[PDB]
Design a protein around this ligand. Structure first.
Ligand SMILES: CC(=O)N[C@@H]1[C@@H](O)[C@H](O[C@@H]2O[C@H](CO)[C@@H](O[C@@H]3O[C@H](CO)[C@@H](O[C@@H]4O[C@H](CO)[C@@H](O)[C@H](O)[C@H]4NC(C)=O)[C@H](O)[C@H]3NC(C)=O)[C@H](O)[C@H]2NC(C)=O)[C@@H](CO)O[C@H]1O
Length: 273
Protein backbone atom coordinates (compact mmCIF):
# COMPACT_ATOMS: atom_id res chain seq x y z
CA UNK A 1 0.00 0.00 0.00
CA UNK A 2 0.94 3.64 0.48
CA UNK A 3 1.34 6.25 3.20
CA UNK A 4 -1.05 9.16 3.69
CA UNK A 5 0.33 12.17 5.56
CA UNK A 6 -1.25 15.26 7.13
CA UNK A 7 0.58 18.51 6.40
CA UNK A 8 -0.03 22.09 7.50
CA UNK A 9 -0.26 22.24 11.31
CA UNK A 10 3.34 23.18 12.14
CA UNK A 11 5.33 25.79 10.23
CA UNK A 12 8.61 23.99 10.92
CA UNK A 13 7.65 20.80 9.08
CA UNK A 14 8.75 22.10 5.69
CA UNK A 15 7.00 23.23 2.51
CA UNK A 16 4.45 21.11 0.67
CA UNK A 17 7.01 20.74 -2.10
CA UNK A 18 9.61 19.34 0.31
CA UNK A 19 7.00 17.01 1.80
CA UNK A 20 6.20 15.44 -1.56
CA UNK A 21 9.79 15.21 -2.78
CA UNK A 22 10.58 12.81 0.05
CA UNK A 23 9.02 10.10 -2.14
CA UNK A 24 7.54 8.51 0.99
CA UNK A 25 3.93 9.68 0.71
CA UNK A 26 1.19 8.69 -1.75
CA UNK A 27 -1.47 11.05 -0.38
CA UNK A 28 -1.26 14.43 1.34
CA UNK A 29 -4.05 16.03 3.37
CA UNK A 30 -3.81 19.78 3.88
CA UNK A 31 -4.97 20.57 7.40
CA UNK A 32 -7.18 22.36 8.05
CA UNK A 33 -10.19 24.31 6.82
CA UNK A 34 -11.32 24.50 10.46
CA UNK A 35 -13.92 27.26 10.22
CA UNK A 36 -17.10 27.10 8.14
CA UNK A 37 -20.86 26.65 8.35
CA UNK A 38 -23.66 28.53 10.12
CA UNK A 39 -22.98 31.74 8.20
CA UNK A 40 -19.27 31.96 9.00
CA UNK A 41 -16.85 32.97 6.26
CA UNK A 42 -14.73 29.84 5.65
CA UNK A 43 -11.18 30.19 6.94
CA UNK A 44 -8.17 27.93 6.52
CA UNK A 45 -5.48 27.53 9.17
CA UNK A 46 -2.01 26.41 8.11
CA UNK A 47 -0.27 27.24 11.38
CA UNK A 48 2.92 29.19 10.74
CA UNK A 49 3.31 28.22 7.08
CA UNK A 50 1.45 31.27 5.73
CA UNK A 51 -1.27 33.80 6.54
CA UNK A 52 -4.29 33.29 4.21
CA UNK A 53 -5.07 37.03 4.14
CA UNK A 54 -4.19 38.94 0.96
CA UNK A 55 -3.36 35.63 -0.69
CA UNK A 56 -0.52 34.89 1.69
CA UNK A 57 -1.08 31.16 1.16
CA UNK A 58 -1.51 31.15 -2.61
CA UNK A 59 2.13 30.04 -2.73
CA UNK A 60 0.91 26.57 -1.73
CA UNK A 61 -0.33 26.03 -5.30
CA UNK A 62 3.28 25.43 -6.35
CA UNK A 63 3.55 22.61 -3.83
CA UNK A 64 0.21 21.16 -4.92
CA UNK A 65 1.16 20.88 -8.60
CA UNK A 66 4.60 19.60 -7.67
CA UNK A 67 2.97 16.74 -5.75
CA UNK A 68 0.40 16.04 -8.47
CA UNK A 69 2.92 15.66 -11.30
CA UNK A 70 4.51 12.96 -9.14
CA UNK A 71 1.21 11.10 -8.98
CA UNK A 72 0.45 12.13 -5.39
CA UNK A 73 -3.18 13.03 -4.61
CA UNK A 74 -3.76 16.14 -2.48
CA UNK A 75 -6.94 16.72 -0.43
CA UNK A 76 -8.17 19.65 1.66
CA UNK A 77 -9.03 18.42 5.15
CA UNK A 78 -12.17 19.81 6.79
CA UNK A 79 -12.37 20.04 10.57
CA UNK A 80 -9.58 18.86 12.82
CA UNK A 81 -9.25 18.88 16.59
CA UNK A 82 -9.73 22.65 16.93
CA UNK A 83 -12.39 24.80 15.30
CA UNK A 84 -15.90 26.19 15.14
CA UNK A 85 -16.86 24.18 12.06
CA UNK A 86 -20.40 22.84 11.66
CA UNK A 87 -23.42 22.48 9.37
CA UNK A 88 -26.67 24.13 10.49
CA UNK A 89 -28.91 22.67 7.79
CA UNK A 90 -29.02 20.87 4.45
CA UNK A 91 -28.90 24.27 2.77
CA UNK A 92 -25.71 24.99 4.69
CA UNK A 93 -24.30 21.73 3.31
CA UNK A 94 -25.05 22.93 -0.21
CA UNK A 95 -23.51 26.36 0.40
CA UNK A 96 -20.28 24.88 1.77
CA UNK A 97 -20.10 22.41 -1.12
CA UNK A 98 -20.43 25.21 -3.68
CA UNK A 99 -17.82 27.22 -1.76
CA UNK A 100 -15.35 24.33 -1.78
CA UNK A 101 -15.99 23.72 -5.48
CA UNK A 102 -15.23 27.31 -6.52
CA UNK A 103 -12.35 27.93 -4.10
CA UNK A 104 -10.45 24.64 -3.95
CA UNK A 105 -11.76 22.51 -6.82
CA UNK A 106 -12.76 22.97 -10.46
CA UNK A 107 -14.91 26.04 -9.92
CA UNK A 108 -14.03 29.73 -10.21
CA UNK A 109 -13.25 32.30 -7.54
CA UNK A 110 -11.25 35.53 -7.46
CA UNK A 111 -10.03 34.69 -3.96
CA UNK A 112 -8.99 31.01 -3.87
CA UNK A 113 -7.16 30.59 -0.50
CA UNK A 114 -4.44 28.25 -1.78
CA UNK A 115 -4.09 29.47 -5.36
CA UNK A 116 -5.20 28.39 -8.82
CA UNK A 117 -4.19 24.75 -8.36
CA UNK A 118 -7.09 22.28 -8.38
CA UNK A 119 -7.14 19.86 -5.45
CA UNK A 120 -7.94 16.17 -6.01
CA UNK A 121 -10.53 15.93 -3.25
CA UNK A 122 -11.94 16.78 0.18
CA UNK A 123 -11.02 15.05 3.46
CA UNK A 124 -13.63 14.75 6.25
CA UNK A 125 -11.94 15.08 9.65
CA UNK A 126 -15.09 15.95 11.62
CA UNK A 127 -14.39 15.36 15.31
CA UNK A 128 -17.03 17.49 17.04
CA UNK A 129 -19.94 19.87 16.55
CA UNK A 130 -23.01 18.73 14.63
CA UNK A 131 -23.61 15.10 13.70
CA UNK A 132 -25.99 16.05 10.88
CA UNK A 133 -25.74 16.86 7.16
CA UNK A 134 -22.24 15.48 6.57
CA UNK A 135 -23.78 12.87 4.28
CA UNK A 136 -25.44 15.68 2.32
CA UNK A 137 -22.12 17.51 1.97
CA UNK A 138 -20.63 14.29 0.61
CA UNK A 139 -23.42 13.93 -1.96
CA UNK A 140 -23.27 17.54 -3.14
CA UNK A 141 -19.49 17.35 -3.54
CA UNK A 142 -19.75 14.00 -5.31
CA UNK A 143 -22.29 15.43 -7.77
CA UNK A 144 -19.63 17.84 -9.05
CA UNK A 145 -17.70 14.87 -10.43
CA UNK A 146 -20.33 14.61 -13.17
CA UNK A 147 -18.90 17.79 -14.69
CA UNK A 148 -15.74 15.99 -15.78
CA UNK A 149 -13.02 15.76 -13.13
CA UNK A 150 -13.48 13.30 -10.25
CA UNK A 151 -13.65 14.81 -6.78
CA UNK A 152 -12.10 12.35 -4.35
CA UNK A 153 -13.79 11.94 -0.97
CA UNK A 154 -11.81 10.75 2.05
CA UNK A 155 -12.53 10.52 5.78
CA UNK A 156 -10.61 10.27 9.05
CA UNK A 157 -13.06 8.82 11.61
CA UNK A 158 -12.06 7.89 15.17
CA UNK A 159 -11.65 4.12 15.64
CA UNK A 160 -14.71 3.49 17.82
CA UNK A 161 -17.25 2.01 15.40
CA UNK A 162 -19.57 3.40 14.33
CA UNK A 163 -18.28 6.98 14.20
CA UNK A 164 -20.65 9.46 15.86
CA UNK A 165 -20.07 12.16 13.23
CA UNK A 166 -19.09 10.37 10.01
CA UNK A 167 -21.07 7.15 10.37
CA UNK A 168 -23.95 8.22 8.14
CA UNK A 169 -21.68 9.84 5.56
CA UNK A 170 -19.54 6.69 5.33
CA UNK A 171 -22.73 4.66 4.85
CA UNK A 172 -23.36 6.48 1.57
CA UNK A 173 -20.58 4.44 0.00
CA UNK A 174 -19.21 7.56 -1.70
CA UNK A 175 -15.82 7.60 0.03
CA UNK A 176 -12.69 6.51 -1.84
CA UNK A 177 -10.24 6.31 1.06
CA UNK A 178 -10.89 6.03 4.79
CA UNK A 179 -8.04 6.44 7.27
CA UNK A 180 -9.35 5.38 10.66
CA UNK A 181 -7.52 7.03 13.55
CA UNK A 182 -6.40 4.29 15.92
CA UNK A 183 -5.20 6.71 18.62
CA UNK A 184 -6.60 9.00 21.33
CA UNK A 185 -9.16 6.22 21.85
CA UNK A 186 -8.40 3.61 24.59
CA UNK A 187 -10.88 0.88 23.47
CA UNK A 188 -9.44 0.49 19.96
CA UNK A 189 -5.81 1.60 20.07
CA UNK A 190 -2.53 -0.14 20.83
CA UNK A 191 -1.50 -0.76 24.44
CA UNK A 192 1.89 -2.18 25.44
CA UNK A 193 1.78 -5.90 24.75
CA UNK A 194 -1.81 -5.77 23.52
CA UNK A 195 -2.69 -5.61 19.83
CA UNK A 196 -6.07 -7.29 20.33
CA UNK A 197 -8.12 -4.10 20.60
CA UNK A 198 -6.67 -2.55 17.45
CA UNK A 199 -6.95 -5.73 15.35
CA UNK A 200 -10.50 -6.31 16.57
CA UNK A 201 -11.40 -2.75 15.60
CA UNK A 202 -9.72 -3.08 12.19
CA UNK A 203 -11.79 -6.16 11.37
CA UNK A 204 -14.97 -4.30 12.29
CA UNK A 205 -14.12 -1.38 10.00
CA UNK A 206 -12.97 -3.43 7.01
CA UNK A 207 -16.16 -5.49 7.08
CA UNK A 208 -18.74 -2.85 7.97
CA UNK A 209 -18.24 0.04 5.55
CA UNK A 210 -18.31 0.26 1.76
CA UNK A 211 -15.32 2.36 0.76
CA UNK A 212 -12.51 2.05 -1.76
CA UNK A 213 -9.64 1.39 0.64
CA UNK A 214 -9.13 1.60 4.41
CA UNK A 215 -5.92 2.85 6.04
CA UNK A 216 -4.45 2.32 9.51
CA UNK A 217 -4.17 5.79 11.05
CA UNK A 218 -1.41 6.24 13.63
CA UNK A 219 0.62 8.91 15.45
CA UNK A 220 4.07 9.38 13.87
CA UNK A 221 5.62 9.97 17.31
CA UNK A 222 4.78 9.68 21.04
CA UNK A 223 4.29 13.46 21.19
CA UNK A 224 1.89 13.48 18.23
CA UNK A 225 -0.97 12.21 20.40
CA UNK A 226 -2.14 11.70 23.98
CA UNK A 227 -1.98 7.92 23.59
CA UNK A 228 -1.89 5.14 21.00
CA UNK A 229 1.67 5.32 19.66
CA UNK A 230 2.95 2.06 18.16
CA UNK A 231 6.71 1.41 17.98
CA UNK A 232 7.85 0.76 14.38
CA UNK A 233 9.03 -2.76 15.24
CA UNK A 234 5.65 -3.76 16.72
CA UNK A 235 3.78 -2.39 13.70
CA UNK A 236 6.02 -4.26 11.26
CA UNK A 237 6.24 -7.66 12.96
CA UNK A 238 2.82 -7.90 14.62
CA UNK A 239 0.19 -5.59 13.15
CA UNK A 240 0.92 -5.25 9.41
CA UNK A 241 1.23 -9.02 8.76
CA UNK A 242 -2.39 -9.31 9.90
CA UNK A 243 -4.12 -6.25 8.45
CA UNK A 244 -2.44 -6.53 5.04
CA UNK A 245 -4.38 -9.75 4.40
CA UNK A 246 -7.60 -7.78 3.95
CA UNK A 247 -8.39 -6.93 0.30
CA UNK A 248 -9.52 -3.50 1.55
CA UNK A 249 -6.13 -2.64 3.06
CA UNK A 250 -4.91 0.60 1.50
CA UNK A 251 -1.91 1.45 3.63
CA UNK A 252 -1.03 3.61 6.63
CA UNK A 253 -1.92 7.18 7.58
CA UNK A 254 0.24 9.30 9.91
CA UNK A 255 -0.27 12.40 12.03
CA UNK A 256 1.74 14.24 11.15
CA UNK A 257 4.52 15.46 8.83
CA UNK A 258 6.21 17.48 11.59
CA UNK A 259 6.43 14.51 13.95
CA UNK A 260 7.28 12.04 11.18
CA UNK A 261 10.49 14.00 10.54
CA UNK A 262 11.50 14.09 14.20
CA UNK A 263 10.77 10.40 14.79
CA UNK A 264 11.65 9.07 11.33
CA UNK A 265 8.57 6.83 11.40
CA UNK A 266 7.72 6.57 7.70
CA UNK A 267 11.42 6.04 6.93
CA UNK A 268 11.37 2.95 9.17
CA UNK A 269 8.16 1.37 7.90
CA UNK A 270 7.89 2.48 4.25
CA UNK A 271 8.87 -0.80 2.53
CA UNK A 272 6.57 -2.84 4.79
CA UNK A 273 3.41 -0.82 4.10
C1 LIG B 1 -7.29 14.45 11.22
C2 LIG B 1 -7.41 14.87 12.68
O1 LIG B 1 -8.52 14.99 13.20
N1 LIG B 1 -6.27 15.08 13.34
C3 LIG B 1 -6.26 15.37 14.76
C4 LIG B 1 -5.32 16.58 14.99
O2 LIG B 1 -6.04 17.77 14.71
C5 LIG B 1 -4.73 16.67 16.42
O3 LIG B 1 -3.56 17.50 16.39
C6 LIG B 1 -3.68 18.81 16.82
O4 LIG B 1 -4.36 19.54 15.79
C7 LIG B 1 -4.53 20.94 16.11
C8 LIG B 1 -5.35 21.56 15.01
O5 LIG B 1 -6.65 21.00 14.96
C9 LIG B 1 -3.16 21.60 16.28
O6 LIG B 1 -3.32 22.99 16.60
C10 LIG B 1 -2.45 23.86 15.95
O7 LIG B 1 -1.30 24.02 16.78
C11 LIG B 1 -0.28 24.80 16.13
C12 LIG B 1 0.93 24.78 17.03
O8 LIG B 1 0.67 25.45 18.25
C13 LIG B 1 -0.79 26.22 15.86
O9 LIG B 1 0.19 26.91 15.06
C14 LIG B 1 0.49 28.22 15.39
O10 LIG B 1 -0.53 29.06 14.83
C15 LIG B 1 -0.30 30.46 15.09
C16 LIG B 1 -1.51 31.23 14.58
O11 LIG B 1 -2.37 30.39 13.82
C17 LIG B 1 1.00 30.90 14.42
O12 LIG B 1 1.23 32.28 14.66
C18 LIG B 1 2.15 30.07 14.99
O13 LIG B 1 3.36 30.41 14.34
C19 LIG B 1 1.86 28.58 14.80
N2 LIG B 1 2.90 27.79 15.45
C20 LIG B 1 3.59 26.88 14.75
C21 LIG B 1 4.63 26.07 15.50
O14 LIG B 1 3.42 26.69 13.54
C22 LIG B 1 -2.13 26.19 15.10
O15 LIG B 1 -2.69 27.50 15.10
C23 LIG B 1 -3.13 25.21 15.72
N3 LIG B 1 -4.25 25.02 14.80
C24 LIG B 1 -5.45 25.53 15.08
C25 LIG B 1 -6.54 25.26 14.05
O16 LIG B 1 -5.70 26.18 16.09
C26 LIG B 1 -2.38 20.88 17.39
O17 LIG B 1 -1.08 21.43 17.51
C27 LIG B 1 -2.28 19.39 17.05
N4 LIG B 1 -1.61 18.68 18.13
C28 LIG B 1 -0.58 17.88 17.86
C29 LIG B 1 0.08 17.17 19.03
O18 LIG B 1 -0.15 17.70 16.72
C30 LIG B 1 -4.34 15.29 16.94
C31 LIG B 1 -3.87 15.30 18.38
O19 LIG B 1 -3.17 14.11 18.70
O20 LIG B 1 -5.47 14.41 16.86
C32 LIG B 1 -5.80 14.11 15.50
O21 LIG B 1 -6.83 13.18 15.52
Amino acid sequence: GGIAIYWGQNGNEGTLTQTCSTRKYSYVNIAFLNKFGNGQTPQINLAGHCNPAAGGCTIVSNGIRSCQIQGIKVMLSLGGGIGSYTLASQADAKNVADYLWNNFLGGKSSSRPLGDAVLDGIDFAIAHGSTLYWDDLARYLSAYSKQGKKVYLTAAPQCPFPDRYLGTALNTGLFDYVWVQFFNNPPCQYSSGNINNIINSWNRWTTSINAGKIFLGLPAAPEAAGSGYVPPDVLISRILPEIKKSPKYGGVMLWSKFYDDKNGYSSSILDSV
